Amino acid sequence: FQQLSARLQEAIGRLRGRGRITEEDLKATLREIRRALMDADVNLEVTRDFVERVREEALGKQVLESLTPAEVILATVYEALKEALGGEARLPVLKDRNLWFLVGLQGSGKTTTAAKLALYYKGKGRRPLLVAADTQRPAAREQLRLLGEKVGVPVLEVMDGESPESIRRRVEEKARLEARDLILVDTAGRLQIDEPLMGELARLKEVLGPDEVLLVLDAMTGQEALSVARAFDEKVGVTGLVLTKLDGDARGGAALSARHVTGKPIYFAGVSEKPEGLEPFYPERLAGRILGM
């Protein structure tokens, strides 16, 4: 979000040591914030509410009567950013037995996140099992098999054209025999939504009943990323989100509009291509970081 932070810390910086600014120094800065949000590809409705929330909250803080208005703005923009990102952190509820679907498009970081998610929980005392659920592309299963060997987590590859009921049986037996307590199913990912695959997807969810359905979204595809969320949600049912490639995220509209566009919380974030690159999402932390704090 290099760009956004830079210009945002600027607009704020453009107020220090000025004393009590008027409703014209303000009006100036707010638009600046609005333009910053736009050049970051933030949803236009989010951008509107955001700017409004800053006008509203700042006046409530008598910015016009403050002797340090830059600290008020910084403060309201901070909360506006924390809210937009999701507010307080959120992590799936870890039960005794967990079966989660990782869904998304090919290249979203979905296969890699399934293996990072496994690695993450393994270090948390969980006993995961990776499941490569693509019944049409051996290579896709193969990719997860290698990813799994590298993070030291077992991988079950479904068979070509294998039925959900079959998959269920095999996964549960391996889970049983290996005391797996966190099951991660990397579903089929394609360059674009496939109606038939969506059907096989919903069906698979129907047979296996995951407690969580996490949609993996590449943060670098801006506003587009979220347009794919409504389809998955509609035809399958998403419980949370994972925003990958935040470390390559120039701009940042995706992450900032996600909670508004999707209505789902971001549990995890991809912050490096490294195995440990995946971490729980902290809206508060990301907000403070954007404002340089």
Ligand X SMILES: Nc1nc2c(ncn2[C@@H]2O[C@H](COP(=O)(O)OP(=O)(O)O)[C@@H](O)[C@H]2O)c(=O)[nH]1
Instruction: Please enumerate, by residue number, every residue annotated as part of a binding site for GTP.
Output: 104-111, 186-190, 244-247
Judged by CB under 6 A, the stretch of 85-93, 129-137, 264-272, 284-292 that binds ligand X is: 264-272
* Contact mark string toward ligand X, 126..155, x via CB under 6 A: -----------------x------------
Q: Which helix (H) or strand (E) element contains residue 182? A: strand 182-186
The yes or no reply on residue 248 touching ligand X (CB under 6 A) is: yes
Any idea what DSSP says for residue 135? S
Length, in residues, of the chain: 293
By CB under 6 A, what part of segment 184-203 binds ligand X?
189
Q: How far apart are CA 62 and CA 245, in angstroms?
A: 39
| Residues 222, 224, 227, 232, Cα dihedral to 10° | -90
Task: State which H helix or E strand residue 145 sits in.
Answer: helix 138-151
Binding residues: 104-111, 186-190, 244-247
**Shortest separation between residue 18's beta carbon and ligand X, angstroms:** 40
Q: Give the helix, strand, coil percentages of the chain, each rounded to 5.
A: 55, 15, 30
- In the DSSP assignment, the letter for residue 159 is P
**Total Cβ atoms within 10 A of residue 158:** 22
* Residue from 272, 285, 288, 291 in contact with ligand X (CB under 6 A): 272
Single residue of 86, 109, 128, 148 touching ligand X by CB under 6 A: 109
* Pick 14 or 145: Cβ nearer ligand X: 145
Q: Point out the residue whose Cβ comes nearest to ligand X.
A: 270
Asked if 273 interacts with ligand X (CB under 6 A), we say: yes
Asked if 9 is part of the footprint of ligand X (rule: CB under 6 A), the reply reads no
Told to check if 252 binds ligand X by CB under 6 A, we report no
Contact status: 239 vs ligand X (CB under 6 A): no
Question: How far apart are CB 247 and ligand X at their closest, in Å?
Answer: 5
- What does the alpha-carbon distance between residue 121 and residue 52 come to, in Å, rounded to a whole number? 40
What is the nearest approach in angstroms of ligand X to the Cβ of residue 73? Answer: 31
- φ, ψ of residue 269 in degrees (nearest 5): -130, 140
Sign of dihedral through CA atoms 148, 185, 254, 59?
negative
Q: Rounded CA gap, 161 and 229, in Å?
A: 26
Alpha carbon distance 40, 116 (integer Å): 28
- Tell me if 86 sits within 8 A of 243, measured CB to CB: no
Among 79-87, 91-99, 105-113, 250-258, the segment contacting ligand X (CB under 6 A):
105-113
What token pair was written down for 224? 């587009």
CB of 259 to ligand X, least distance (A): 19
Identify the residue among 82, 277, 282, 283 touching ligand X (CB under 6 A): 277
Residue 45 in contact with ligand X, rule: CB under 6 A = no
Taking CA atoms, 125 is separated from 118, 119, 180, 183, in Å, by 11, 10, 11, 14
Stretch that binds ligand X, among 4-12, 81-89, 196-204, 243-251 (CB under 6 A): 243-251
Nearer to ligand X by Cβ, of 142 and 181: the residue is 142
Q: Which residue stretch of 32-40, 55-63, 228-236, 242-250 sits at the interface with ligand X (rule: CB under 6 A)?
A: 242-250
**Under rule CB under 6 A, residue 29 binds ligand X:** no
Instruction: By CB under 6 A, name the binding residues for ligand X.
Output: 106-112, 143, 189, 244-245, 247-248, 270-273, 277
